[PDB]
Amino acid sequence: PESLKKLAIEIVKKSIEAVFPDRAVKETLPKLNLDRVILVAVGKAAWRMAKAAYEVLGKKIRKGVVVTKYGHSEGPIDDFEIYEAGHPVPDENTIKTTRRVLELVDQLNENDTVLFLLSGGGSSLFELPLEGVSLEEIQKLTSALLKSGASIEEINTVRKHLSQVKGGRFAERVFPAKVVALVLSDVLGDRLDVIASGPAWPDSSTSEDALKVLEKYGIETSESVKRAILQETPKHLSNVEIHLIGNVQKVCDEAKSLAKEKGFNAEIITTSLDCEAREAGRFIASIMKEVKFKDRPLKKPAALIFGGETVVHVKGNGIGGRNQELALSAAIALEGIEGVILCSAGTDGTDGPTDAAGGIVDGSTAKTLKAMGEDPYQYLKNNDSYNALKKSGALLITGPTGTNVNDLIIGLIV
Numbered sequence: 001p002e003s004l005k006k007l008a009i010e011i012v013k014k015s016i017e018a019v020f021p022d023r024a025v026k027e028t029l030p031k032l033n034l035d036r037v038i039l040v041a042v043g044k045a046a047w048r049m050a051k052a053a054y055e056v057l058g059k060k061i062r063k064g065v066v067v068t069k070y071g072h073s074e075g076p077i078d079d080f081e082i083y084e085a086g087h088p089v090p091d092e093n094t095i096k097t098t099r100r101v102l103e104l105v106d107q108l109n110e111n112d113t114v115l116f117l118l119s120g121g122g123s124s125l126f127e128l129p130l131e132g133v134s135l136e137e138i139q140k141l142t143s144a145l146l147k148s149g150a151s152i153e154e155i156n157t158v159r160k161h162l163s164q165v166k167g168g169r170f171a172e173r174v175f176p177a178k179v180v181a182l183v184l185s186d187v188l189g190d191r192l193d194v195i196a197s198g199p200a201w202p203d204s205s206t207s208e209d210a211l212k213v214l215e216k217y218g219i220e221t222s223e224s225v226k227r228a229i230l231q232e233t234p235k236h237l238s239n240v241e242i243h244l245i246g247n248v249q250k251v252c253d254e255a256k257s258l259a260k261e262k263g264f265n266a267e268i269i270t271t272s273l274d275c276e277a278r279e280a281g282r283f284i285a286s287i288m289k290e291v292k293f294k295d296r297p298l299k300k301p302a303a304l305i306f307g308g309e310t311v312v313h314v315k316g317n318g319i320g321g322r323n324q325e326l327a328l329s330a331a332i333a334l335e336g337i338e339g340v341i342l343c344s345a346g347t348d349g350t351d352g353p354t355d356a357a358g359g360i361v362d363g364s365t366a367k368t369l370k371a372m373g374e375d376p377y378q379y380l381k382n383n384d385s386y387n388a389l390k391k392s393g394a395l396l397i398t399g400p401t402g403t404n405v406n407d408l409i410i411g412l413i414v
Contacts, residue, residue: 005360008343008412009396011258011303015410016347018254019246019403021048021119024184028245029056029115034180036112039064039080040101042126042196043119045184047073047082048402050117054078061115063104067097067125087124095135098128098165105170108177116170116179120186120404122196128164130228137225138162141214148217156194160203160233161210162225166196167203167233171240174200178239184246186404188274188309192242200240203233248307248406251347255410259303264412266303273308273407277322278380280310281329281342284411288340289333291413298413300339306409318384321352323407327359327394328385332376337363341412349401352386357398358407359389368392 017023029052039061041050046068054061054077064080066073069087076082081100085093105114129138138159145155160167171179179200187194192201210229214221252268259266269287273280284306291302298304310322320328323344330342344358345351351358366376369392379388389395 004341004412004414005362007262008341008410009360011255011262012343012345012396012408012410013398014258015251015255015408016345016398016401016403019184019251019347019405021045021184021402022052024245025049025052025117025182026056028182028243029053032180034113034115035060037061037115038104038108038112039115039117040104041065041117042067042122043117043184044069044072044087044121045119045403046117049119049182049184050080051077053115053117054080065101065104067101069121069125085125087121089139090124090127090135094125094127098126101126102128102164102173105174105177108174110176112177114174114177114179116181116200118181118196119184122199123159126165126196126199129162130164130231132224133162133228137222141219141221144219145217148219150213150217152194154213156197157205158210158213159197160205161207161229161231163197165199168198168201168237169233170199171237172234175239179241181240181242182245183242184403184405185244186406188248188406189272190244190247200237200242202235202237204235205233207232246403246405248408251405251408252305252307255305255408259305264301264303265298266305267298268305271307273306273310275310277310277312277325278329281326282333284342284409285330285333288342288411288413289337292337292340300414302413304411307407309406312383314383316382316384318379318382318387319352319354320383320385321346321354321356321358323351323358324354324356324385324389325380325383326409327361328376328380328388331361331365331394332380334361334363335366339414342409343396344407344409345396345398346407347401347403347405349398354386355397356386356389356395358396359385359394360396361394365392365394
């Protein structure tokens with residue numbers, strides 16, 4: 001009873017380890033046989049990904065540079081240059097460090113290779129406007145577009161046409177050298193045209209597209225900006241190889257195999273979960289009830305695996321997060337059923353603005369709350385999932401993982 005809870009926590013903890021930067025790199029990079037390497041690592045996981053590459057390659061790296069969030073770097077790595085910069089918004093340090101990265105990659109020859117180690121936050125952490133466009137203008141134009149209700153693709157079209165590195169321009173500067181990118185994806189569906197706005201990915205959108213977006217949302221812009229946009233972005237790239245070394249699929253696969261390794265009939269139901277968090281908790285609960293009482297779509301002992309990135313339409317003023325709402329909603333749906341554990345987790349280690357990664361619940365959780373005089377629906381209505389789970393000993397606390405590939409959910413039935 002106690003032990004099944006422990007079993008699911010271990011599976012969740014060990015599944016996430018499969019996408020820690022160190023292990024993700026070491027399980028991929030050696031197979032690629034890289035030589036004459038300039039290492040460029042950008043992202044919230046930049047420092048650990050760089051350290052792991054150094055250990056694989058050593059002096060085959062001729063120069064290394066690291067840009068990550070303030071407070072994220074963990075000291076020297078041989079003689080690599082270690083930098084930190086603005087996130088979630090780019091600042092003067094972003095400009096400085098990006099400018100330095102372009103000094104490291106210009107005038108390389110066909111025989112050289114850039115090892116591009118990429119994780120979350122790269123739109124903010126990797127940026128240098130085109131000559132005559134200001135960072136402020138970029139900050140302001142983005143915010144104007146968001147507020148006006150522009151789509152992420154429309155924001156992206158405009159951003160790529162204001163930048164020296166987005167929209168494939170980075171790969172274009174590395175030319176004639178090769179780009180081999182290792183990507184640790186925090187974007188659902190691992191869309192490389194969106195991840196960091198595709199600095200080593202061709203930009204299918206045009207200057208015309210960018211200007212039509214601004215016109216569409218009535219956003220006024222300088223002459224400087226409009227004539228910066230007229231410089232078309234690379235429509236094709238010949239010097240790039242991309243490998244996804246971490247994403248939500250890898251994490252689901254590892255949980256599937258860890259679960260099998262423990263005697264469970266295990267399957268992945270989906271890795272593209274994106275609906276409302278509380279409604280997803282009920283759907284998953286309904287599947288668990290099918291297994292429990294009808295022994296399908298898996299026979300007991302069963303392990304159902306889910307991955308994705310749910311959302312919460314915030315109506316109240318509580319504290320919580322998507323994974324904690326998904327768990328709290330499920331505990332309501334599973335009240336009174338023996339033999340069921342559900343465990344949800346942000347692979348961050350951080351669900352909402354909290355120290356918890358998610359929830360760990362069963363058929364007693366809701367009645368533990370009722371027996372204390374609390375009402376589970378009221379915590380959910382008020383978006384106060386964190387507190388409901390703390391009161392019933394159902395918070396999953398992992399700590400920061402040093403990675404982010406969205407959400408893992410696991411349901412066990414016996």
